[PDB]
Amino acid sequence: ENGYTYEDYKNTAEWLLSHTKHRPQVAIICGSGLGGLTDKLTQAQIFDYSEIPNFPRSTVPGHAGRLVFGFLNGRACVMMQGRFHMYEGYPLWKVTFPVRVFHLLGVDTLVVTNAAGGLNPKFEVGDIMLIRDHINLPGFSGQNPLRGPNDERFGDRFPAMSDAYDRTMRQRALSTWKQMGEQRELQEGTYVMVAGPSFETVAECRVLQKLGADAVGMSTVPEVIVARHCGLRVFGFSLITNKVIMDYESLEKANHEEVLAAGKQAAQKLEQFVSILMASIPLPDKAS
Numbered sequence: 001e002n003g004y005t006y007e008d009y010k011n012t013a014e015w016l017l018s019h020t021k022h023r024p025q026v027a028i029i030c031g032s033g034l035g036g037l038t039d040k041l042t043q044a045q046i047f048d049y050s051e052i053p054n055f056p057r058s059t060v061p062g063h064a065g066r067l068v069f070g071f072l073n074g075r076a077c078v079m080m081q082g083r084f085h086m087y088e089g090y091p092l093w094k095v096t097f098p099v100r101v102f103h104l105l106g107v108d109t110l111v112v113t114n115a116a117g118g119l120n121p122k123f124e125v126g127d128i129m130l131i132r133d134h135i136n137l138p139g140f141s142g143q144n145p146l147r148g149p150n151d152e153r154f155g156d157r158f159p160a161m162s163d164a165y166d167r168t169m170r171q172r173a174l175s176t177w178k179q180m181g182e183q184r185e186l187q188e189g190t191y192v193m194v195a196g197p198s199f200e201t202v203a204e205c206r207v208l209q210k211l212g213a214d215a216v217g218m219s220t221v222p223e224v225i226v227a228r229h230c231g232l233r234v235f236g237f238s239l240i241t242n243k244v245i246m247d248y249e250s251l252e253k254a255n256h257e258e259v260l261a262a263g264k265q266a267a268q269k270l271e272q273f274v275s276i277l278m279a280s281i282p283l284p285d286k287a288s
C-alpha cells in the first residue's frame with residue numbers, strides 16, 4: 001500500500017469524477033503497440049497523468065502517457081495509453097495506483113494487455129495469448145503490490161489469485177475469436193512476470209520454460225493483483241512480439257526495438273478483438 005493514503009485514492013477518483021461526465025465501467029490498460037485502441041473511443045475525454053492529482057507522471061513519454069475516457073462498443077471505458085513498469089523505477093504501489101483509482105471511479109472490470117515474448121514453442125510471433133494464469137516472480141520475493149498495511153476498504157489481507165483471470169470471459173474470448181472466424185486460434189497459457197529492463201539469456205529462457213511459463217513479460221501481474229484485491233473481474237491478452245531464444249544458435253531475435261509486431265496488423269487485430277469483447281463484458285445491471 002505505502003506512499004499513498006486511502007484518501008489519496010479518494011481525492012484522485014473524486015477529482016476525476018468532477019472532471020469528466022463519464023463514469024466508466026471498464027478500465028483497459030494498453031500494452032506496447034496496442035495503444036491504438038484509444039482511437040476507437042467515442043466522446044473521448046483525454047487527460048495527462050500529470051494533470052491528474054496523485055497520478056504517477058511518465059518517465060519518458062511526454063509523447064503520450066495519458067488516460068482517455070469514452071465509450072467503446074457500448075461500454076463506458078477508461079484507457080491507459082502507456083502503462084507504468086517496475087524497470088522504470090516505479091515502486092509497485094505506484095505502478096498500480098491507477099487500478100485503485102479505477103475501482104473508486106466505479107470500474108468493475110479491468111482488461112489488461114501487454115506484449116510478451118514466447119516461451120511455448122507452439123507460439124508464433126503475432127500470436128495472441130489469452131492469459132489463463134501467471135507466475136509472479138517478483139512477488140515471490142516481496143515485490144508484490146499488496147505489501148504493507150492492508151486496507152479492508154479495498155480488500156482482504158490475504159487475497160487469492162488462484163482465480164484471477166476470469167473464467168467466463170475466457171470462454172467468451174475463445175468463442176468471440178471463432179465468431180470472427182479468424183483462421184489461427186487465439187492462444188492461451190501462463191504469463192511469467194519478470195522485471196529488469198534487459199532481455200533474457202538462453203539459460204534464463206530455459207528456467208522460465210521449466211517453471212511452466214508460455215509467455216514472459218515485464219508488467220501486468222501487479223495490476224491484475226490489485227484488481228483482484230479490489231474485486232475487479234480480470235481478463236487479458238498478451239501480444240507475442242518475439243520468440244525468446246531458448247537455444248544457443250537461432251539469431252532470430254526477440255525484441256522491442258523490433259516491436260514492429262506490436263506496430264503491425266498483429267496489434268491492429270487485437271485492438272478490434274478487444275473492441276468486440278466489450279459487448280460480452282457484463283453490465284453492472286446484470287439484467288436477464
Ligand SMILES: O=c1[nH]cnc2c1ncn2[C@@H]1O[C@H](CO)[C@@H](O)[C@H]1O
Binds near residue numbers: 117199200217
Ligand atoms: O522476450 C521478451 N522478454 C521479456 N519481455 C518481453 C519480451 N518480448 C517482449 N517483451 C515485452 O516487450 C516490452 C518491450 O517492447 C517490455 O515492456 C516487455 O513487457
